[PDB]
Amino acid sequence: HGEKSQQAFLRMRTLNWYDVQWSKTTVNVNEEMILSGKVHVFSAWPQAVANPRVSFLNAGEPGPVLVRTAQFIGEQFAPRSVSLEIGKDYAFSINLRGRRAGRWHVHAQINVEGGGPIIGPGQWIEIKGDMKDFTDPVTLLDGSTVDLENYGISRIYAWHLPWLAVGAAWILFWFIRKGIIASYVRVAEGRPDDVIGDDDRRIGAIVLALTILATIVGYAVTNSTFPRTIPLQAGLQKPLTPIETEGTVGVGKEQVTTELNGGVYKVPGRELTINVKVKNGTSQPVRLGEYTAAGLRFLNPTVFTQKPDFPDYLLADRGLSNDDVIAPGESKEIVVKIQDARWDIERLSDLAYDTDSQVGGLLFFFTPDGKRFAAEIGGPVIPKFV
């Protein structure tokens, strides 16, 4: 949720989400599902957003309704931050584990360092059962298993509460053994000294000497339990592996290419019309299947005869069209008509408000058999008012 309020051009020209899927939409407390998909980092990465050199994968979700059990991107377990390279594609997946009952919108999400959150597509997940039943658990190196949901917590209170109590007793003691007004008056009149003097200092010298003892003891005791400890493990991870299959923007002998040649989007607010100069570097006649923008899919009903498993919200069955197998080696300019309410609803139409009136995203081209060949589209587009 909320991504609807981020600026269109930024959503469009940073991450181009695709093949995002959610494994299970329904799970009991303790049951896993994987959220997975792919991401193409847009080659004209905007100046407003720091370099995705320093980034983090995530499950957009309202607090820990599902617990993340591991995640991967690049081809790499990623508990720490990663580097995405401009203009390249990455597979990612998250394993999540049911914790609080309800119904929840769980997106793919990537945050870029001087950047902000970029929010990938999301799906409603029903989690049923009782949060009381939730467990991890998790294996230490010394062979034991802990339940992270509860682990360490009473040991915190066992240390925190007593001191908060010794805290109060020090205050009450002094307040009551010769008080506030009585003390204000003494100081303001003659000297204090009727307020403080050994044995008042003796008490303090004592209390201190106990305090440092209790501190030492608690320290040496906790080194006896827990004698081998590591510092937090932090730092960027080795460069990731991009998707080399197969494919797949700017990879292998067989490509599609798409130059944008100006475009028009009505304000307000449901249509975007674009001239695409396509080059078919493949050896097979290809039809345009799909435009994807900011999570959003605009499908060609001619190609997607019917009709994928994908969120509401989101899935638009009109990114028509013109049917004419672009021929192998051919080089043609086609007029594409993105129409659907979802453009307005996910506020891509608010592009007219931005400091950079310019689309980005991917186009998917299909052979007569299976193969999907991908091209980056992006560039200046002009608004046409009312």
Binding site: R68, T69, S81, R155, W159, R186, L208, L232, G235
Partner: protein, 242 residues
């Protein structure tokens, strides 16, 4: 007095004494908590921000501020030796109530992820150094050095369990890191952190000891400044014009 008896005199003194303690306690709690929350953050909020270098540095230094101001008020005007602990406990209570009732109670983050920094112990050191030598100058030095040094050890018993090692898909992690990854925060990417990440200029083995000594020495300055702040906030001046 302006009192009908001695009984009315004593009954008034004891109950204005309560009201004043309670109003002062929650007044300072507010000031201290907002200030601290906005600065020491961040490192107090989150278990996997409590490293060997940053945390035991930023915390004692930002935390000594209101202890010094509170000592300035309580010692100068009443000779009551609980300014530090007064302020510190306030912070603790304000923090704990929130972590429990909200971080956990509202948002379901486990308390192992959101427990606050332990400060009562150094706060005590601070208070009794002032008591033993009714000098803010000796306190600003030896008092607040102890404030620094003491920080890490007094946290170690709450902290150490999370610094046990796990292996997760081939890669070492502390439990802290793991509680971090597990209990998903929407805006806490591992890189926004600001924890120790290594340097070529570290020799030892000495990470925590130097951070302790650093925080001791820097707190002295902050303590000197904030003592006087306490004095200026104690002002009984009237001004005539607005």
């Amino acid at each position: 007095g302006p009192f009908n008896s001695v009984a009315e005199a004593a009954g008034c003194v004891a109950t204005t004494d309560w009201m004043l303690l309670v109003l002062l306690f929650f007044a300072v709690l507010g000031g201290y908590h907002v200030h601290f929350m906005l600065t020491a953050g961040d490192w107090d909020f989150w278990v996997d921000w409590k490293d060997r270098r940053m945390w035991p540095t930023v915390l004692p230094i930002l935390g000594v501020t209101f202890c010094a101001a509170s000592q300035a008020f309580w010692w100068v005007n009443f000779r009551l030796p609980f300014g530090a602990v007064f302020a510190v406990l306030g912070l603790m209570i304000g923090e704990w109530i929130n972590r429990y009732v909200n971080f956990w109670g509202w948002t379901y983050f486990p308390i192992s992820l959101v427990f606050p920094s332990a400060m009562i112990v150094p706060a005590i050191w601070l208070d009794v150094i002032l008591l033993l030598s009714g000098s803010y100058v000796i306190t600003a030095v030896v008092g607040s050095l102890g404030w620094g040094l003491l920080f890490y050890p007094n946290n170690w018993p709450a902290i150490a369990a999370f610094h046990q090692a796990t292996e997760q898909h081939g890669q070492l992690m502390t439990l802290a890191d793991l509680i971090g990854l597990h209990f998903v925060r929407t805006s806490m990417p591992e890189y926004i952190r600001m924890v120790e990440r290594g340097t070529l200029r570290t020799f030892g083995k000495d990470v925590v000891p130097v951070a302790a000594f650093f925080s001791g020495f820097v707190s002295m300055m902050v303590y000197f400044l904030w003592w006087f702040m306490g004095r200026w906030y104690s002002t009984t001046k009237r001004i005539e014009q607005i």
